[PDB]
Design a protein around this nucleic acid. Structure first.
Ligand SMILES: [Mg+2]
Ligand SMILES: [Mg+2]
Ligand SMILES: [Mg+2]
Ligand SMILES: [Mg+2]
Ligand SMILES: [Mg+2]
Ligand SMILES: [Mg+2]
Ligand SMILES: [Mg+2]
Ligand SMILES: [Mg+2]
Ligand SMILES: [Mg+2]
Ligand SMILES: [Mg+2]
Ligand SMILES: [Mg+2]
Ligand SMILES: [Mg+2]
Ligand SMILES: [Mg+2]
Ligand SMILES: [Mg+2]
Ligand SMILES: [Mg+2]
Ligand SMILES: [Mg+2]
Ligand SMILES: [Mg+2]
Ligand SMILES: [Zn+2]
Lengths: 143, 78, 130, 132, 195, 36, 177
RNA sequence: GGAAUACUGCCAGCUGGGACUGAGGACUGCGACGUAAGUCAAGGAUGCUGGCAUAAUGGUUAUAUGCCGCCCGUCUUGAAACACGGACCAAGGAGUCUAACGUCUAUGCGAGUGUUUGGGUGUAAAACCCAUACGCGUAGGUUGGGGCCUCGCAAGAGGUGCACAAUCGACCGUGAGUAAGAGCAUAGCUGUUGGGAGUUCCUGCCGAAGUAGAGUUAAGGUGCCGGAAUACACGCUCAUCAGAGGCGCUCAAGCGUGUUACCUAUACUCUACCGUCAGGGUUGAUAUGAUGCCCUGACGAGUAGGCAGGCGUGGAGGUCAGUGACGAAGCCUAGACCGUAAGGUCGGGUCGAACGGCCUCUAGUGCAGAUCUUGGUG
């Protein structure tokens, strides 16, 4: 109170806007392969592990397969393909949002590779990048 | 074609891009009427003021902390 | 007669009034706290009134009451606000006890601004002395 | 009709301000009626003579009522006996004022009536004949 | 109570039709006692005789519309303004949607929106109507206070139909192949597109 | 200040009509008339 | 919000002359910032006594450079005053970077010779930190040129130009162009 | 016999993708759910993440290169063009004061009202005051009835009754009636009659016979200029009169007849904004002129006609203890700011001695064209 209020302070009206947990798109499910459309790893195929509280999807390359480390990715900048891997092998509880502010990636990668081996040619798929060739129309293209 | 529908909003009317309404000032006494309304108003020295008076007005305005719209006019050009 | 005086001053020549480009009016009256010609503003319009006004280094408080409406020479009682800002606000509130909130709020704001102006004119005119 | 008196008289405007405030803040329709009357032009404010006041009081049960005339009251020498009452009106001619004072009555402005009867209790409004 | 009444009334009409057919005797429905009218034509190039009628029906602009009680007196008024308006029998669903979305109440001639039951109560409790749905019942039926409830509602302001007007040319009568005229139940198709 | 359409916002819909809540649970709109 | 008291300024000056610390410098500079921004604009400090304000201005302009030099003593190299390499210098450098535009506002608000001389001297003892910046070194040389350009006192102009020579001839690299 | 599907209709049935809007600024209300406490999508957007500057960029100016246009007026579409006309420069350039009656408004007085017909007085036409006359004025019954009183929480029960009306009558002298008058004077605006007697500063408003975003849509249109299918389906027609803004078109880009889709307006819906109107709130005083502030709603085309509000130009009174060689007034200013605009403020230039702002009353806004005339030039 060391200064009397010069002019006046207009208090903001109370806001009836409570934040609620996000409702993700139906295609996104744990163990779903993803295509990243921007950033350092744009056009690179990655695996989906879990959805964080702050609405940043968590993804692993695996770094072993394609050199993409554990990372947070925005959901809207990602395409979801119809091919899946079982994520039950990897537990994915410890690492969280605040944690993001090598050994863990190795632990995750061993379990995820274990499931990757069963499906044919999946490692090659995750290794290679994606791009649009001439004559490719996305709207028909089933991803 | 001019017409009333083009009229500007009252809350934004008569406002410079700096956000200060321009008020004409002739002498120090008229400057002092804008002592606290520094946020709402900015002073503008009249065209007919002599150079000797303009420096005094500018000094008093700086002391009061009132924005002058046209300083360095007739003390500098443009 | 304050209402009559105000109505004449409003719909006739308030010589201290200046019509700004926006349409807002400013009374030039030195005693005026709020330099805007209104019902609550013209010291001429209102019998009960107060203002902070600077004389030399001091920031005096001027009081106006209907009792001294006659004898305008002695009308404005002069009170010295203490240099301590907190003490000054306390003295203003005390003297303006049971006094309409408009004049009290405006008086406090004017005291704050005049104190800042005194500080900053001390700033602009700092000299080698002391 | 009007929303404010066309006259530029300061005192009429003050009375209009008081009565519009009362009509806004009083349930009684009396304040509304007098407020609407205050706006009227001279032709629509015919003079109500002391004669009409005498008739209005002769009506049964109205002897002690405060007669109200939004306008001017004029004397009438036709009468010799005039009862005592506290007429209220905007203006009073010298003859009418003398007649009211002489008979023990008294004349008040409409502000004094508002102080007396903010809800217009026991009031009797009168209006002059606007034949032409 | 109103919901049960509506369901029972509809089932009763259907059952009466089925029973009459089974007996071999025709069934005739009671003539509809309510119509909804909508303005189709601009004010210009209108004679005085239809112009005065349009004022009575509370229609002052194109695409506005209102409910009208069906009587021998009122039917001839519609006949007078046949070129410039399109009208038909409104179903319950259309009236409900109109009242909920575009409903506006006349409170001291100030077109107050009907956003709360209290607003309707303060005006129409004198007539025993305390909610939006009570008003909807008074409208869908011809109640003892239909005039007052209908007059309380501000004339509806409707957008042009989303799908379109149907026929390429509007200004012919409904059978001739144009928008204006008595189209009866099909008004429900139009109004829902407009609302 | 703003008009909230009952059809799109359930809260105001319930405010205008309480019986709408019960009717939604009952689903009388999709009720089955007896086959008879 | 702390209120400036004639006690608090006295204590800050008391511990300035003996064993100052970066916390004290940031506190002093923030108070200085409020002092210079009173007419032209959250702030931790409030100013109410003219004695406290004048004492703050005095001690700041006349001794905060002294403490700054003592913490991070520059060394004369090829005629130029250059700071050394070290962490402590960098911390002090951000502190002078938090004092510079208060000096700029004072420069833009010069009205007489002695105030010009004091501001220019305090600015003089803070070149070696502000040569590392170009929003400040430019506006510095732009402001004092502004003073050298707009003053009507020949002594003020002489002081401004003498400052320009003394600072320019020392360094010649960042400023002279 | 068993049904299914199609169509129509309803759902206060779910769930997905788009686009525009984020208006409001302590709380109050209707609500919803919560055992409860509290919470919320319930009377207008908040939260999370990232970056946040010698930048992002923005302005001015100059060459060279090529494309198009290219005497002037009018005309023209939407626009150059095109269709129609053109000795040359400078000017000047189509009538006046005043009266009679009447409506409305404001002020003063009031059965009155007006003075000035004269005189006194006078820092002297004045201002202040007296008479002196005449002018124009004066010479009930009942029902309803705004209002006020009682009872009533309220609806009502009544009681009483302004103006005025309704009929009912008395008297005076069958109405202008009386039975309880209003006029006079001044000023403003203004209707008519008159005495010689082309357009019209800007904005708004009322009315015979609006700005911006989103969506929808009429009239129309979907070869390109140009935004939309060179889409479909029929019947035709290419005629030496084929047939329709420009270019162009001929199994049409020509017709008539139907189908959808699509483009979009001063039209309709929602929002925000600006104006006019209307209804409101607000004083043992407002955090800014109760002619203020605030809330809510409706409308904005409008021809004939009518009304208001602003801008600018002079005259006078008052005022800003206004402005001025450290530069007043006047003029210009493809500069900055403001206002929807008429314009205003400032900067600069020019100018070189005085003038402006503001309250009041009083005068008073820019163009067109003809007869031609004169000088001057062919
Ligand atoms: Mg100028
Ligand atoms: Mg008269
Ligand atoms: Mg009687
Ligand atoms: Mg469409
Ligand atoms: Mg819809
Ligand atoms: Mg609204
Ligand atoms: Mg949707
Ligand atoms: Mg009578
Ligand atoms: Mg009677
Ligand atoms: Mg629009
Ligand atoms: Mg559109
Ligand atoms: Mg307020
Ligand atoms: Mg209207
Ligand atoms: Mg109109
Ligand atoms: Mg003058
Ligand atoms: Mg000019
Ligand atoms: Mg503009
Ligand atoms: Zn004033």
């Amino acid at each position: 109170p060391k200064w009397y209020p010069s002019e006046d302070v207009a208090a903001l009206k109370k806001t009836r806007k409570a934040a609620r947990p996000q409702k993700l798109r139906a295609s996104l499910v744990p163990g779903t392969v993803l295509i990243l459309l921007a950033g350092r790893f744009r056009g690179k195929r990655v695996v989906y592990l879990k959805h964080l509280e702050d609405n940043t999807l968590l993804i692993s390359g695996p770094f072993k397969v394609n050199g993409v480390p554990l990372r947070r990715v925005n959901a809207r900048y990602v395409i979801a393909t119809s091919t899946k891997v079982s994520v039950e092998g990897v537990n994915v509880e410890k690492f969280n949002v605040e944690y993001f502010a090598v050994e863990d990636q190795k632990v995750v990668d061993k379990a995820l590779i274990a499931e990757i081996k069963k499906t044919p040619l999946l490692k090659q798929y995750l290794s290679a990048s994606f791009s649009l060739k001439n004559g490719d129309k996305p709207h028909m293209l089933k991803f | 074609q001019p017409k009333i529908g083009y009229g500007s909003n009252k809350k934004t009317k008569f406002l410079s891009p700096s956000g200060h309404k321009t008020f004409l000032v002739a002498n120090v006494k008229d400057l002092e009427t804008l002592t606290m309304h520094t946020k709402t108003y900015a002073a503008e020295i009249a065209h007919n003021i002599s150079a000797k008076n303009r420096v005094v007005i500018l000094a008093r305005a700086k002391a009061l902390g009132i924005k002058v719209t046209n300083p360095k006019g007739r003390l500098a050009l443009e | 007669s304050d209402e009559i005086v105000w109505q004449v001053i409003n719909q006739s020549f308030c010589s201290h009034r200046i019509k700004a480009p926006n349409g807002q009016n400013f009374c030039r009256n030195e005693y005026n706290v709020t330099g805007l010609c209104t019902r609550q503003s013209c010291p001429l319009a209102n019998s009960k009134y107060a203002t902070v006004k600077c004389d030399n280094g001091k920031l005096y408080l001027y009081m106006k009451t209907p009792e001294r409406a006659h004898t305008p020479a002695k009308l404005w009682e002069r009170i010295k606000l203490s240099k301590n800002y907190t003490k000054a606000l306390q003295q203003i509130d005390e003297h303006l006890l049971h006094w309409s909130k408009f004049f009290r709020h405006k008086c406090k704001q004017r005291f704050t601004k005049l104190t800042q102006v005194m500080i900053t004119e001390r700033r602009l005119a700092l000299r080698e002395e002391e | 009709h009007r929303t404010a008196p066309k006259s530029d008289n300061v005192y009429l405007k003050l009375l209009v301000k008081l009565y519009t405030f009362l009509a806004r803040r009083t349930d009684a329709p009396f304040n509304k009626v007098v407020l609407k009357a205050l706006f009227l032009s001279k032709i629509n404010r015919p003079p109500v003579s002391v004669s009409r006041i005498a008739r209005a009081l002769k009506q049964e049960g109205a002897a002690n009522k405060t007669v109200v005339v939004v306008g001017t009251v004029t004397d009438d020498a036709r009468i010799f006996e005039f009862p005592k009452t506290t007429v209220a009106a905007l203006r009073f001619t010298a003859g009418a004022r003398a007649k009211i004072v002489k008979a023990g009555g008294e004349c008040i402005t409409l502000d004094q009536l508002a102080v007396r009867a903010p809800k217009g209790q026991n009031t009797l409004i009168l209006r002059g004949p606007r034949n032409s | 109570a109103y919901q049960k009444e509506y369901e029972t009334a509809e089932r009763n009409i259907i059952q009466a039709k089925r029973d009459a057919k089974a007996a071999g005797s025709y069934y005739v429905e009671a003539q509809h006692k309510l119509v909804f009218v909508v303005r189709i034509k601009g004010i210009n190039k209108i004679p005085p005789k239809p112009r005065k009628v349009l004022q009575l029906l509370r229609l002052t602009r194109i695409n506005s519309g209102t409910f009208v009680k069906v009587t021998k007196a009122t039917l001839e008024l519609l006949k007078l303004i046949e070129p410039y308006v399109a009208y038909g029998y409104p179903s319950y669903s259309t009236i409900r949607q109109l009242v909920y979305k575009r409903g506006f109440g006349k409170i001291n001639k100030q077109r107050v929106p009907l956003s709360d039951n209290a607003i309707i109560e303060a005006n129409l409790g004198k007539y025993g109507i305390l909610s939006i749905d009570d008003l909807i019942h008074e409208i869908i039926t011809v109640g003892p206070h239909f005039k007052q409830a209908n007059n309380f509602l501000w004339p509806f302001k409707l957008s042009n139909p989303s799908g379109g007007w149907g026929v390429p040319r509007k200004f012919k009568h409904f059978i001739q192949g144009g928008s204006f005229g008595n189209r009866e139940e099909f008004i429900n198709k139009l109004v829902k597109s407009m609302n | 200040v703003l008009k909230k359409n009952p059809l799109k916002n359930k809260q105001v819909l319930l405010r205008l009509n309480p019986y709408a809540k019960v009717f939604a649970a009952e689903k009388l709109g999709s009720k089955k008339a007896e086959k008879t | 919000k702390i209120e400036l008291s004639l006690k608090l300024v006295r204590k800050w000056k008391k511990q300035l002359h003996d064993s100052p610390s970066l916390k004290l410098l940031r506190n002093i500079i923030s108070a200085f910032k409020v002092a210079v921004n009173l007419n032209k604009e959250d702030y931790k400090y409030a100013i109410t006594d003219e004695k406290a304000f004048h004492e703050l201005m005095f001690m700041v302009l006349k001794d905060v450079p002294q403490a700054i030099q003592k913490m991070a003593p520059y060394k004369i190299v090829k005629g130029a005053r250059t700071l050394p390499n070290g962490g402590n210098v960098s911390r002090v450098s951000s502190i002078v970077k938090s004092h510079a535009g208060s000096l700029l506002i004072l420069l833009n608000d010069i009205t007489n010779t002695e105030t010009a001389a004091l501001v220019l001297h305090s600015v003089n003892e803070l070149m070696p930190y502000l040569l590392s910046y170009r929003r400040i070194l430019k506006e510095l040389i732009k402001s004092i040129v502004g003073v050298w350009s707009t003053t009507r006192e020949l002594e003020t102009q002489i002081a401004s130009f003498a400052f320009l020579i003394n600072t320019t001839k020392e360094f010649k690299k960042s400023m002279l162009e």
